């Protein structure tokens, strides 16, 4: 009689480009559309929700507890609760596991969990309370400081990617091929309509017109190898990691509605999947992109699955270098990984990404009739997170 | 059979005044000292820790995931994990409940949970990406915007307190009396040595000398009713809420180390208590200070306890108005509530407070041999969280 | 033996739109281009310049005495001197008068004088030395604060324009019909090449391509009365002044090479004119747009001239309201006023505008063979300035 | 015959220390007390003033034309005119020459001229119209950027003083000797009452106290060669210039009232002095402190004087190295130079400094009965200004 929790429904916004479609859209407005969507898609009313849990790395200047803001905007009643959390890129996936645990421990029946992020709306800051008697001082980009810079070594996440490139002897040609493939896979899936089911359209309100956004705008159409080859290294001058083989700076939100297996049955819901297991593990910050290796092995151990039992995998592509290292070590068939493309093409709204790649996994598992899936991401500061999903 | 999680050990720093002892100390440095302390106090080595979970409302400018920063500084190995979370004032207590759930679901054996906050070090900010083509703009105090302003009604938490004062007909004289009592209780507890056990001293590293902080600096000695009566209302010009009958802006951290009851017995630890129940519930943001009412009632229901069964209560004092409302409604003997004073005297380091009052409750239950306790806080945006503890 | 000073040569950059052509070009660079221009137009070498005087209203963040930076870039030797001044919109024509005085008093042989302005490059500022212990503070737009806001009445210069409109009972249709006439006059002069002689090209240095600017970008092509009548009142919500019948925010520079009449004759220079008189006078800041009325009448009195003796006038069109009032009062033939259009069309780079209109007058006076001319402008704070010029 | 222009009256505020006495006083409020005081000391009515001309280097944020703001607050009517100018530390003296020229050309009868400066009220700024798309940026100290950094070689003025000390072979013992002796002369003069006449008290409007300032606060009492010699270099790590032998950051205003000699005779005003000549010359920027050398020679040649003729001199001490070198090259008796101390002691309110020293020169010339005086300053960017005075 071990607790069994299902994902009844899921949805994500399109991922916007940096200072692009969602340039002036607070993360909680994206989150509120995603909440509304999961509820509609499951046939569950906002009144029934007990808690909303949203990963978010960059909430500065957005006001008190943006998760509660997103819940309230979506009509979740004042009697429910809401909170935010931060395990960097792991957050939007880890929030799902956190939601599962509220149900498993008997503290809630119905949870909406995911993540949301507006990198565009992240402010610049400075600690000014003591005062600057005289001289210049720095206004810090909170996106770079709080999101992308390692706190122990003082360098960008891209440098950890270089470290991984060096350790696994990953050529600039291998990384570029990977990146072009991600773009081409993503472009094909977009064109074929494979992101329609997962995406809920977002209405960006405007004085001189509302704009509906329902397409992933960061995916480059007709990306060429030559384009990638011409780029300068972004983080080391004799490096291999570029703006082209790294993911970008992006905005979006994504979520899942969770409840027990027996609850879904009473309601007659056909869930998108059952949460079979999850794990999170640390690694050295210097090679943080390696996190998915110990996390995915641990999740699989917990599920009682072999790597070869998986039918589909979403492994987040923060950088080609790390995505390549993860596939090499794990040895899973690359043909079942990121089948509709990855973050290099789609983008990386940090605190939402974990939920974004769960959406992609779940709606692809449904479409192809895949029985077993895994979602995993690397995490700045040296962690990984993984979740195993089975179809009902 | 139902998991049973204990609190093996706890510690807090002293609570620093705004721009006082800890004016330039990042929250994660406070956190690291508390993690070190819980480990030392339980006889558990840092290598044994699976995860650190730290509430924190105001991390802007602090760099990537200050929870991980705190853990690493404390010697928790890279293979462990760490994350932060934000349910505002509820955070440092909610983190404990969340850590108890990691154990209950079999994902972890040993958790360090609590919170940390440096309101002093919170920066000013502005979104500057799209530019400011023309016209003035605000550099926003993130402490006020993200910590203390209601996101729905646009006013400060102190206005919610006013809303509560009016609905419950709480006079200025009653609120001031409650405030002077909190000061006087805290001063007496301090002088008698009652905060020694819970406090771990913090070494503020300087250049012209190191300074050890082990006393709660915000407590006013010899606080007079006359000094309370002379202050002007701080949020409504015909109001009743003042700087004197509200808590303050403060820095500190606090934590507990958690493990199963069976694991404590194996190690021969005498735990500070067993987590018997917890709960979180929403209320209207306009009267957010009333959150402890439904949360405490729900926590008690889940424990199987009557209000009368409690021997000791820590009910956080964000404002005299709400504290007095909570006490009236619940009807618990005020002589068992906040016996060593509350936050009006001690301070309100937002994301650490829930774990700070847990520390106070635990060490006082131990001191006086009390069997059943309850800790509870109000939460901006209209929530409450409560936890029930029993002696072992 | 009265001194007699001539404008040997003159030149201006073209006028840039707010954040357009010259969006990132420092004032002194524009200034340097115009200094080189007047030197080379006169056939005078920069080593022969004694002193450069540049009006400039918004110099903040451009570093030490930008008049010295424009001089020194332009190849004026270190042994010369250089300074800036601020009589607001008066500055650029006042600087010409001040140079005339250096020559009349025996202190200099040869002056370059004019003004420069980059309203684009004006920063935002805040006083921050005390430092801000808590609370939002304002980042002040120095363009609006130091350029456009009355320091006595607190409101914009366009509010002083409403005051003049109401006094003189200037309707919305009379203001719009003057606005459209100014745009049409200017697109005609532009199309006919009448701005070629006065405009010196400016090269905007770039990474992906140098850009040559030699045409006024703020002039609207095909300006209709209907487009003008669609606009909303910009300053008073049931007012008459709009974005269409006021000038805008602009960048540019303008100067003149000044020397004694006898010096020009030595050097074979055929001067654009002789400065016959000038005057500056004050009025009420509330109706500063009336400024040109006493200053133009004082200048004419000093020249021993009657208003009917003028063949050409340049009267700056800060607002259609004040420009209509000045014309109405003085009663000069509107067919000789701003014949190539005015500032509503050309733009209003404040501290340069007085040298800008001086350029347009001198060159058209050469073109049609006019003998007698007058330039005048209003001045925030309640002043006017005027100059009379005669052809040689 | 030649126009003879006299200084009817002069007044100055005491000099304030950075963030001290006048820490939150706008410059124009200081300017207005000196304008009102020049009128009172002369017995001339404010209505009879044609124009106010004020030097000011650092007006960012202060509002439209602070010279006008000064003039209107002083009770000069709206009919008159006002403007500011910037030759950096030459401005306060240059504004006097400019007022002199207004009268010599016949465009005005009565002028108030000087300089004003609030270095304390000078803001931080950044250009943010285009926005900052990503990355950290600098908020610039306008006091440093616009007041004290060379636009050409990018270093502090205290490095151009280091350059004069390597060229003139000036030791660190020679510069300490000049700075002790300056404080001694200044402190002895202050307690002597020799500054009383020239100073006009300023009322700093508080809220819990009006405070009257009539003493130069920056002057240190009992200044020895030891605390001079115990400071480390300020601009070069192996350098000679220190906080002790540089002047400082300061606030203040100063002005003189100008009219013709014949007009002073009509008004029964016994003038402080007649202006006989002035001059401004440029020098290599790298060694700007040499300005006062060519500028005083020229002023002296225009007057038809020999250097031996001077019975008193004010040579501004911006630095000890620049001042010792001007005393070296010109060869005038050091006993008559800065006899009541100088700016190392007194302070250096940039745009007001030239008017400041003109005040001390004039009031001391009257006391001691000296006929021929000279005032001069070095200017950033490489200039000197100087004016020759003769008491009648």
UniProtKB/Swiss-Prot annotation, chains A, B, C, D:
Pathway noted in the entry: Biopolymer metabolism; poly-(R)-3-hydroxybutanoate biosynthesis; Metabolic intermediate biosynthesis; (R)-mevalonate biosynthesis; (R)-mevalonate from acetyl-CoA: step 1/3
Main location: cytoplasm
SUPFAM superfamilies referenced in this protein's UniProt entry, alphabetically: Thiolase-like
Cited Pfam families: Thiolase_C, Thiolase_N
GO molecular function, one term: acetyl-CoA C-acetyltransferase activity
Active site: 89, 348, 378
Gene Ontology BP, a term: poly-hydroxybutyrate biosynthetic process
CC per GO annotation: cytoplasm
Localisation: Cytoplasm
Annotated EC: 2.3.1.9
Entry keyword Acyltransferase: yes
Alphabetical keyword list: Acyltransferase, Cytoplasm, PHB biosynthesis, Transferase
Top-level taxon in the UniProt lineage: Bacteria
Residue ranges the record marks as coiled coil: none
Record's catalysed reaction(s): 2 acetyl-CoA = acetoacetyl-CoA + CoA
Subunit structure and binding partners: Homotetramer.
NCBIfam families recorded: AcCoA-C-Actrans (TIGR01930)
Family label: Belongs to the thiolase-like superfamily. Thiolase family.
Name of this protein: Acetyl-CoA acetyltransferase
């Amino acid at each position: 009689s071990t607790p069994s929790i299902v994902i009844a429904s899921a949805a994500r916004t399109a991922v916007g480009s940096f200072n692009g479609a969602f340039a002036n859209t607070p993360a909680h407005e994206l989150g509120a559309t995603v909440i509304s969507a999961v509820l509609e898609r499951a046939g569950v009313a906002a009144g029934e929700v007990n808690e909303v849990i949203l990963g978010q790395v960059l909430p500065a200047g957005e006001g008190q507890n943006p998760a509660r803001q997103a819940a309230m905007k979506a009509g979740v009643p004042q009697e429910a609760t809401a909170w935010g959390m931060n395990q960097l890129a792991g957050s939007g996936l880890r929030a799902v596991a956190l939601g599962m645990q509220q149900i498993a421990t008997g503290d809630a029946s119905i949870i909406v969990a995911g993540g949301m992020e507006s990198m565009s709306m992240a402010p610049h800051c400075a600690h000014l309370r003591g005062g600057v008697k005289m001289g210049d001082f720095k206004m810090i980009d909170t996106m770079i400081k709080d999101g992308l810079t390692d706190a122990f070594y003082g360098y960008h996440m891209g440098t950890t990617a270089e470290n991984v490139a060096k350790q696994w002897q990953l050529s600039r040609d291998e990384q570029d091929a990977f990146a072009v493939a991600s773009q081409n896979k993503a472009e094909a899936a977009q064109k074929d309509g494979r992101f329609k089911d997962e995406i809920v359209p977002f209405i960006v309100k405007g004085r001189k017109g509302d704009i509906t956004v329902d397409a992933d705008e960061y995916i480059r159409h007709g990306a060429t190898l030559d384009s990638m080859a011409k780029l300068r290294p972004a983080f080391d001058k004799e490096g291999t990691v570029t703006a082209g083989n790294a993911s970008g700076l992006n905005d979006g939100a994504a979520a899942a509605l969770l409840m027990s297996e027996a609850e879904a049955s009473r309601r007659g819901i056909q869930p998108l999947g059952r949460i079979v297991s999850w794990a999170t593990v640390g690694v050295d910050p210097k090679v943080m992109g390696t996190g998915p290796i110990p996390a995915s092995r641990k999740a699989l151990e917990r599920a009682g699955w072999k790597i070869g039992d998986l039918d589909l995998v979403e492994a987040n592509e923060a950088f080609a270098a790390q995505a390549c290292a993860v596939n090499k070590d794990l040895g899973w068939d690359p043909s079942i990984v990121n089948v509709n493309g990855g973050a290099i093409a789609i983008g990386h709204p940090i605190g939402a990404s974990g939920a974004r790649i769960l959406n992609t996994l779940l709606f692809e598992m449904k479409r192809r009739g895949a029985r077993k899936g895994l979602a995993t991401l690397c995490i700045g500061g040296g962690m990984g997170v993984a979740m195993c999903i089975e179809s009902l």
